[PDB]
């Protein structure tokens, strides 16, 4: 059965200077190299999808599937107990290949398959005392799966910290893009202090993986997991508990940047060109 559980509320914030990655797997030391590639423009709009999860009162769907456009910059503040991946596709049905990303507590599973499911993806996890480890069922949550073609497994992308400070630290800055047959996904995990949203400063996004697929994507969505205390009952309001499943979204556009590398070759700075007259001058 298809059910919705997220109280998706769309507020607006500024993009500031977050989401610029390393253009290619090439090192440079102490150079002011300048690039031209899809990136999140500075001081842009971020649709803060502030929300409360674990709510049975939102049974009707209220979260539209966000567009993919020319690159999506993503950030979150939730552990693997809340958010567990991203969904990409063109029609998000069994007619076109759908990319489903699941981030297990011990591994990462990426599957491209003709998944048939509704517009409310979720994963309900609970360690019942009968076995202390219960496995989810694809047939229950998802309607169908046909002609699965690509499967990839790796280590956890979310080295989540149990502490609340670490819980806020988990800024999984995952730029997703499809260029030259390449689904490039970068990574970041800042130990930055807790706040409300994207703080100041800059930190480049190192390549998490470069899948050799790079197919066009139209709709992008956030796959979240049902947060539970491993002791609450099942299908009840006293089961899935309320919690803030906040996740932000950006949008990449074609843009030229002036990078700046430190001694280690990390991109320690990036500036835009078409931002302002000073940016064009620089």
């Amino acid at each position: 059965q298809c059910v919705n559980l997220i109280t998706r509320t769309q507020s607006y914030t500024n993009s500031f200077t977050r989401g610029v990655y390393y253009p290619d797997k090439v090192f440079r030391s102490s150079v002011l190299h300048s690039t031209q590639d899809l990136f999140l423009p500075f001081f842009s709009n971020v649709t803060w999808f502030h929300a409360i999860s674990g709510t049975n009162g939102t049974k009707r769907f209220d979260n539209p599937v966000l567009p993919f456009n020319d690159g999506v910059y993503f950030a979150s503040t939730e552990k693997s107990n809340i958010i567990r991946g991203w969904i990409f596709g063109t029609t998000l049905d069994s007619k076109t290949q759908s990319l489903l990303i699941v981030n297990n507590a011990t591994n990462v599973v990426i599957k491209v398959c003709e998944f048939q499911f509704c517009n409310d993806p979720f994963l309900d996890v609970y360690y019942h005392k009968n076995n202390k480890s219960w496995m989810e069922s694809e047939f229950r949550v998802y309607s169908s799966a046909n002609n699965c073609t690509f499967e990839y497994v790796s280590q956890p992308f979310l080295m989540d910290l149990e502490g609340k400070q670490g819980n806020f630290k988990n800024l999984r800055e995952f730029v997703f893009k499809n260029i030259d047959g390449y689904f490039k996904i970068y990574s970041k995990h800042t130990p930055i202090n807790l706040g409300r949203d994207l703080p100041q400063g800059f930190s480049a996004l190192e390549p998490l993986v470069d899948l050799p697929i790079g197919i066009n994507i139209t709709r992008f969505q956030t796959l979240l997991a049902l947060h539970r205390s491993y002791l609450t009952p099942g299908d009840s309001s006293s089961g899935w508990t309320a919690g803030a499943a906040a996740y932000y979204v950006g949008y990449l556009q074609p843009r030229t940047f002036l990078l700046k590398y430190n001694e280690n070759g990390t991109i320690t700075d990036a500036v835009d060109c078409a931002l302002d007259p000073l940016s064009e001058t620089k």
């Binding site: 390393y22 797997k25 090439v26 090192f27 440079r28 030391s29 102490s30 150079v31 190192e206 390549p207 001694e263 280690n264 070759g265 990390t266």
Partner: protein
């Protein structure tokens, strides 16, 4: 591919990074492909006569 002198390097390498570079597009360093070591490519001593 190149010709030069492979010398030990005192420069730290970011683990993500593969091979060195200089401002004038020159490969002035290279991580050893067999094991994680950084080797500076010193130009051969050619001057003139």
């Amino acid at each position: 591919t190149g010709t030069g002198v492979l010398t030990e390097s005192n420069k730290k390498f970011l683990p993500f990074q593969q091979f060195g570079r200089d401002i004038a597009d020159t490969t002035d360093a290279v991580r050893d492909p067999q094991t994680l070591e950084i080797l500076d490519i010193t130009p051969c001593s050619f001057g003139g006569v």
